[PDB]
């Protein structure tokens, strides 16, 4: 995860966005942060989606994930205060590559595209 800038309305939303980005990164510490009983095959032994299983497990509890992810030094980045594993805002330290913006940054546009013979869609 090179960088992540979140703009959640409340701490819970910020945590959800951070966890989703963390899992989407597929980082090794993310994978190694799994703790407890997490099964990637259902009772029928059908293979579950590992990404969804990790999302569910980390949304159930994310303390271990934030503890094992890392902290990065943060300067006084205007309107980009850092966030700490305990979910309290911080200025000097933050989760590695994670910043919180208060500008409420907020895509839906449908761009017309051309699709070639081999189903390659180019703008």
């Amino acid at each position: 995860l090179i960088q992540l800038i979140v703009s959640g309305k409340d701490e819970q939303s910020i945590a959800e966005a951070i966890i989703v980005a963390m899992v989407f990164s597929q980082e090794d510490c993310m994978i190694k942060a799994v703790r407890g009983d997490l099964n990637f095959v259902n009772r029928a032994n059908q293979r579950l989606n590992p990404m969804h299983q990790l999302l569910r497990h980390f949304q159930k509890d994310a303390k271990v994930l934030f503890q094992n992810w890392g902290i990065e030094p943060i300067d006084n980045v205007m309107g980009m205060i850092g966030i700490l594993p305990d979910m309290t805002p911080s200025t000097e330290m933050s989760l590695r590559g994670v910043r919180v913006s208060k500008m409420g940054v907020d895509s839906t546009e449908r761009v017309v595209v051309s699709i070639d013979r081999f189903l390659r869609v180019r703008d």
Partner: peptide, 17 residues
């Protein structure tokens, strides 16, 4: 406005305490 098309998983997080 801002909306989620399809939200899987249980959501939330116990880290917030």
């Amino acid at each position: 406005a801002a909306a989620a098309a399809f939200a899987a998983a249980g959501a939330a997080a116990a880290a917030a305490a």
